[PDB]
Design a protein around this ligand. Structure first.
Ligand SMILES: Nc1nc2c(ncn2[C@@H]2O[C@H](COP(=O)(O)OP(=O)(O)OP(=O)(O)O)[C@@H](O)[C@H]2O)c(=O)[nH]1
Ligand SMILES: Nc1nc2c(ncn2[C@@H]2O[C@H](COP(=O)(O)OP(=O)(O)O)[C@@H](O)[C@H]2O)c(=O)[nH]1
Ligand SMILES: [Mg+2]
Lengths: 48, 430, 52, 427
């Protein structure tokens, strides 16, 4: 059992790795576009 | 695909609309020319090359405010046929706008609205704005709603109107127009949100360091509330909320539809750095009468239906914790026959700000809509003022001469009275 | 199937040309109409100056 | 050859089912595009039970997704396994859900069902055999409640022999998402009692309690909650796909656990759940699993078994363990706690042992229980529905759709009768 748990922990780390990319991409792409729509669109009207 | 038509009446509707479209174009990121440097169908309509056109009709019997938009920076965004301006205003007279002047231009506006709806196949409802004290606002709003009732039948005709302030008033004949509009709105309107100028004036300084705001600052606060209401229809969220969802839950009876509105956190651009603005803070501060946009104390009345709409880093676990703590507040009372009384919806898109502006870069925000019997406090003042006016027949000759029959005034008075008894009967316990 | 995928690409390009034709021509026509007003500058402002 | 058809409805059902397909796909070892790149030969033996093969080395699941509004499926198609589902298996209208049971049953339910039954029939007869259908729907809302009940009634009309096993979420008592939820729950119970054979119900507040108590999840989203429902889903049907020391399918479970036609509502639980930081202190053995399984704090239903008594119970095991140890533990747990078991039914505990453990967990077990504690769940909605029904408030909205006010009285009378039936069988 533990003999296969040695492989099992590695595969769990692989699942954790997939979660890492998915959550990280969902956050990094979301934040900067959100700031652009708010602030960069804001800057135009400040000059206006 | 899925769509809302915006209709604006009178001076306030145009000026409120101008601020809202400023927020909407920024929040999606569409340039003032309609080009770029999604859920566009919700408020934006698409044309040939890159140009976007907004799904709005601006109506006023006075061309002054409309001509400002025609000359203004946003002149290219709006299609010229959407901007309809009359010749002479209703002169703060309900009868003049209802019968004499309004009926001259009514047919043109309805055709424009109907033509717009063809491109808008995903229609779910209409949003309409009025001034209660105004003549064109309230007077033309009644005829427009009455026609639309038979034109479209079962369609959500939501409204957002400015109710007269308890003490601040800028029109002597204001009580006449409000009592006449109230009779018209209570029948056909599906659900009409209420705000007043005086509480907006108080919050614009209490919540943020602006010593002397103008109509511009007030319009931005209104636009923020409308944006959060339509935010669930525009972006992904953990709990999608549609217009029919609000319509079923908010109103328990036909004539008790009138809700109240609130928003939090409203905080200056500097103080936001001092406070965490966690989910507990934004939820707890909503129920305070200071944050109410309608100057009626909830402690006088009771709560029967509440809705929470969240935008930010909201986690569902904190929502349950926040709601549970609210129910432990002995200062807040609920009707026994409505144990739950809460619908909450979560959206991921944060609020968007505007420069030369009043708000801050709040990471998470929340919108609050509720129905309370405290609105009965406001109605009694309007009824009392009207009785003083009609006791000596203060301004009857102006309204009668414009075609309106005198027999309507007692009828509208009875309708307000029946609403007052209906609110009292509902608030009664058993 | 891939061949019709490029065939779908041809349809997309043609439907793009449909918008491009209006996109450029209708803008040009308005520019010419503005220059017609530039002609109206001299047929009126200076001609009525001759009327003065 | 015991293929099971999977059906989803509503936002809640579609998201949970989407998480279910991720777990079952990972269990067999199927790439998100439908091609096999697994690791063992035993994975291919009975893959037909949940998948159809599209010539080319691609597997298409026996799944149907239904929603009244198109918003939910946009996330589903954008998901990791969105492409797996058949494009013609997406059946939906273009009207809002409305959060109304009567609207979801009479206005849009009639129009959608005529389109849905053909897809179900096309999926049902595509396989040589079909033991029963599998449904995930929400009782609290309008779409999942009304559409689920209507589709269950229609399936019972067409397939009397098949086992209609359904999974549902009962509205939470304290902090729930809907004002008018008791109306939908009360109306849905009437059809759910008489139509479905096997029923499982989950309380969301129990999920939050379980997640925070055990797994120390600082930020519990809907994903982990949907994930927990997935292991309950996967462990339920583990026997059909793989061998073991004792085989038990859905029909075995229904005959063993259902003593009477109206007592078939079940609660579920899964083990082992351990804190991700302190999981390296647990020498997990069969006695440890039994303690975790039978513990009240690990039950996915917000009803304490100690407040009532048990009627039937069953435990499914996964992995390589001794059959004597399971039997000895099972006898010991029955003898030690005789206060909660009826005297007239000895040996109320049924066993089932599959051979292959799930991924990530060297050995696992699943519990399904039936008890008289169900009265508390029905008590909460009954009191809330009575309060709502007192002042005639929201009857108005349901009147405009076509529902008669007497339907509330019939539904409450039926549910109260079920409460009484659970009460008198306690003796
Ligand atoms: N909050 C807010 N209120 C406004 C704004 N503009 C106008 N109003 C309100 O509009 C009300 C009356 O509007 P008027 O223009 O005088 O009347 P009307 O509704 O257009 O009808 P007419 O009498 O024909 O002009 C006033 O009580 C104002 O409070 C605005 O920009 N913001
Ligand atoms: N566990 C879980 N619950 C959910 C999820 N999505 C929605 N819910 C809950 O389900 C209820 C609404 O269900 P819904 O699908 O809208 O019902 P419907 O309108 O009849 O289809 C709400 O109380 C939500 O809190 C999810 O992904 N997981
Ligand atoms: Mg005006």
């Amino acid at each position: 059992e533990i003999e296969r748990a040695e492989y099992e922990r590695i595969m769990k780390l692989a699942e954790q790795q997939m979660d890492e990319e998915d959550r990280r991409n969902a956050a990094e792409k979301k934040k900067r576009q959100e700031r652009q729509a708010a602030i960069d669109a804001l800057i135009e009207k400040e000059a206006k | 695909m899925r769509e809302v038509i915006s209709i604006h009446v009178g001076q306030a509707g145009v000026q409120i609309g101008n601020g809202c479209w400023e927020l909407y174009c920024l929040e999606h990121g569409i340039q003032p020319d309609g080009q770029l440097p999604d859920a566009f169908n919700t408020f934006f309509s698409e044309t040939g090359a890159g140009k976007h056109v907004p799904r709005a009709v601006f109506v006023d019997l006075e061309p002054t405010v409309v001509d400002e938009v025609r000359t203004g920076t946003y002149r290219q965004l709006f299609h010229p046929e959407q901007l309809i301006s009359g010749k002479e205003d209703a002169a703060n007279n309900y009868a003049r706008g209802h019968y004499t002047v309004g009926k001259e231009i009514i047919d043109l506006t309805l055709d424009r609205i109907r033509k717009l709806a063809d491109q808008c196949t995903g229609l779910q409802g209409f949003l309409i704005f009025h001034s209660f004290g105004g003549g064109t606002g309230a007077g033309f709003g009644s005829l427009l709603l009455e026609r639309l009732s038979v034109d479209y039948g079962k369609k959500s005709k939501l409204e957002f109107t400015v109710y007269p302030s308890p003490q601040v008033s800028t029109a002597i004949v204001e009580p006449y127009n409000s009592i006449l509009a109230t009779h018209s709105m209570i029948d056909h309107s599906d659900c009409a949100f209420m705000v007043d100028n005086e509480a907006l004036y108080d919050l614009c300084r209490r919540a943020l360091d602006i010593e002397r705001p103008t109509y511009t600052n007030l319009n931005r606060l209104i636009g923020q509330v409308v944006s959060s209401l339509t935010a669930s229809l525009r972006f992904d969220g953990a709990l999608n909320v549609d217009f029919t969802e609000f319509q079923t839950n908010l109103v328990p009876y036909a004539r008790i539809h009138f809700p109240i509105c609130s928003y939090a956190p409203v905080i200056s651009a500097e103080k936001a750095y001092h406070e965490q603005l966690s989910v507990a803070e934004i939820t707890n501060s909503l129920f305070e009468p200071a944050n109410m946009m309608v100057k009626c104390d909830p402690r006088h009345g009771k709560y029967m239906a509440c809705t929470l709409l969240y935008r930010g880093d909201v986690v569902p676990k904190d929502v349950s914790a926040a709601v549970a703590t609210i129910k432990t507040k002995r200062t807040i009372q609920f009707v026994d026959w409505c144990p739950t009384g809460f619908k909450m919806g979560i959206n991921y898109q944060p609020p968007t700000v505007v420069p030369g502006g009043d708000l801050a870069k709040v990471q998470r925000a929340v919108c609050m809509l509720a129905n309370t019997t405290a609105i009965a406090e406001a109605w009694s003042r309007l009824d009392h003022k009207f009785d003083l006016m009609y006791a000596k027949r203060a301004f009857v000759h102006w309204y009668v001469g414009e075609g309106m029959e005198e027999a309507e005034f007692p009828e509208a008075r009875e309708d307000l009275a029946l609403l007052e008894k209906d609110y009292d009967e509902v608030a009664a316990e058993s | 199937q891939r061949a019709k995928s490029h065939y779908d690409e041809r349809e997309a390009s043609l439907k793009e040309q449909r918008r491009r034709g209006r996109a450029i021509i209708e803008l040009q026509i308005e520019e010419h109409k503005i220059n017609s007003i530039l002609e109206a500058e001299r047929r009126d402002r200076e001609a009525k100056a001759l009327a003065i | 050859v015991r293929e099971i058809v999977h059906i989803q409805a509503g936002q809640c059902g579609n998201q949970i089912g989407a998480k279910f397909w991720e777990v079952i796909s990972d269990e067999h070892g199927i790439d998100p595009t439908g091609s096999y790149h697994g690791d063992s030969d035993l994975q291919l033996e009975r893959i037909n039970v949940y998948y159809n093969e599209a010539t080319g080395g691609k597997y298409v699941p026996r799944a149907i997704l239904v929603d009244l509004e198109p918003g939910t499926m946009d996330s589903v198609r954008a998901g990791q396994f969105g492409q797996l589902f058949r494009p013609d298996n997406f059946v939906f209208g273009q009207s809002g859900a409305g959060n109304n049971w009567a609207k979801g049953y009479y206005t849009e339910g009639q129009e959608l069902c005529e389109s849905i039954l053909d897809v179900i029939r096309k999926e049902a007869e595509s396989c040589d055999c079909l033991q029963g259908f599998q449904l995930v729907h929400s009782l609290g809302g309008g779409t999942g409640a009304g559409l689920g009940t209507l589709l269950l009634n229609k399936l019972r009309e067409e397939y009397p022999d098949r086992i209609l096993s359904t999974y549902s979420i009962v509205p939470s008592p304290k902090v729930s998402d809907t004002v008018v939820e008791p109306y939908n729950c009360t109306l849905s119970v009437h059809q759910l009692v008489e139509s479905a054979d096997e029923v499982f119900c989950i309380d969301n507040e129990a999920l939050y309690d379980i997640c925070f108590r055990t797994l120390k999840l600082t930020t519990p989203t809907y994903g982990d909650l949907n994930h927990l429902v997935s292991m309950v889903m996967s462990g339920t049907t583990c026997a059909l796909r793989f061998p073991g020391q004792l085989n038990s399918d859905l029909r075995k479970l229904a005959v063993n656990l259902v003593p009477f036609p109206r007592l078939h509502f079940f609660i579920v639980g899964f083990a082992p759940l351990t804190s991700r930081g302190s999981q390296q202190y647990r020498a997990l053995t069969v006695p440890e699993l039994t303690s975790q399984l039978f513990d009240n704090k690990n039950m996915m239903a917000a009803c304490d078994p100690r407040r009532g008594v048990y009627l039937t119970a069953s435990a499914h095991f996964r992995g390589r363990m001794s059959s004597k140890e399971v039997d000895e533990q099972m006898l010991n747990i029955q003898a030690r706690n005789t206060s909660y078991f009826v005297e007239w039914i000895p040996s109320n505990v049924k066993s089932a042992i599959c051979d292959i453990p799930p991924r990530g967990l060297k050995m696992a077990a699943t519990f399904i229980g039936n008890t008289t504690a169900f009265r508390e769940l029905f008590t909460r909605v009954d009191s809330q529905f009575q309060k709502m029904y007192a002042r005639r408030a929201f009857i108005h909205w349901y009147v405009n759709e076509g529902l008669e006010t007497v339907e509330f009285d019939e539904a409450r009378s039926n549910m109260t009768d079920l409460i009484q039936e659970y009460e008198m069988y306690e003796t």
